[PDB]
Design an enzyme around this catalytic site. Structure first.
Site, PDB file in Angstrom:
ATOM      1  N   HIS A 142       0.772  -0.958   0.049  1.00 40.29           N
ATOM      2  CA  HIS A 142       0.399  -0.202  -0.084  1.00 40.29           C
ATOM      3  C   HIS A 142       0.924   1.603   0.013  1.00 40.29           C
ATOM      4  CE1 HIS A 142      -3.618   2.144   1.165  1.00 40.29           C
ATOM      5  NE2 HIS A 142      -2.335   2.901   2.035  1.00 40.29           N
ATOM      6  N   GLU A 143       2.270   1.475   0.941  1.00 39.23           N
ATOM      7  CA  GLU A 143       3.220   2.802   0.734  1.00 39.23           C
ATOM      8  C   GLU A 143       3.917   2.289  -0.446  1.00 39.23           C
ATOM      9  OE1 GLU A 143       0.739   2.857   4.177  1.00 39.23           O
ATOM     10  OE2 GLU A 143       2.166   4.331   2.651  1.00 39.23           O
ATOM     11  N   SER A 166      -7.498   0.144  -0.188  1.00 34.99           N
ATOM     12  CA  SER A 166      -8.677   1.136   0.517  1.00 34.99           C
ATOM     13  C   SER A 166      -8.241   1.812   1.654  1.00 34.99           C
ATOM     14  CB  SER A 166      -9.275  -0.884   0.635  1.00 34.99           C
ATOM     15  OG  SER A 166      -8.234  -1.666   1.665  1.00 34.99           O
TER      16      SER A 166
END
Length: 201
Positions: A142-143, A166
């Protein structure tokens, strides 16, 4: 394949608190980091990005930066240290700091948006916040997605509810990037197209 081939050579830094958490056992820490990388690589397959671990640095003696509760502050200190020290050890494209720090605001990860390849800003900080390797690997992914120009998934733009970008993680987190994320990546390759990720190891 929807996207042209790219490559991200990762450096992972394990801080002293995480070293202590895993019984000061380098072998065990290396195995966990490799498993995280294998998961990041799997998640990046639909983006046609080959992920490799260019460098693993475990801070077995002491922390080299002031790891602290504010994740953005820690990220800035980490980026400065990456540009001054880590990049001089071995070239790589993006670095993530793994820590057991209880970051402020119930934070489990943070990164700069859209700065992949930048010497100081191609970084993320991630909390080793679950015994489940996948939960930490999807946080690293995600990062990384943010650093590749992705913002959080938005219902008006795409319908996925458990994709990697998300707004909040959950126990049903999927390993897929949404259409919002893939479109953000196309925008990034078009408008930014950083050179370091065109280079195979």
């Amino acid at each position: 394949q929807r996207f042209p081939q790219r490559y991200i050579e990762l450096a992972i830094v394990v801080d002293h608190g995480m070293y202590t958490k895993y019984s000061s056992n380098f072998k065990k820490i290396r195995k966990r980091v490799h498993q995280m990388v294998s998961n990041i690589n799997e998640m990046c397959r639909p983006l046609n990005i080959a992920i490799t671990l260019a460098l693993l640095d475990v801070w077995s003696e002491k922390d080299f930066i002031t790891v602290q509760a504010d994740a953005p502050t820690t990220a800035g200190l980490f980026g400065d240290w990456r540009e001054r020290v880590l990049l001089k050890k071995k070239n790589h494209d993006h670095a993530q700091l793994l820590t057991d720090t209880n970051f402020a605001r119930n934070t489990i990860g943070w990164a700069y948006v859209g700065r992949m390849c930048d010497e100081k800003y191609s970084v993320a900080v991630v909390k080793d916040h679950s015994s489940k390797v996948f939960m930490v690997a999807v946080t690293m992914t995600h990062e990384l997605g943010h650093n590749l120009g992705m913002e959080h998934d938005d219902k008006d733009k795409c319908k996925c509810t458990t994709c990697i970008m998300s707004a909040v993680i959950s126990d049903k987190q999927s390993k897929l990037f949404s259409d919002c994320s893939k479109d953000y990546y196309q925008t990034f390759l078009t408008n930014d197209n950083p050179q370091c990720i065109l280079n195979a190891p």
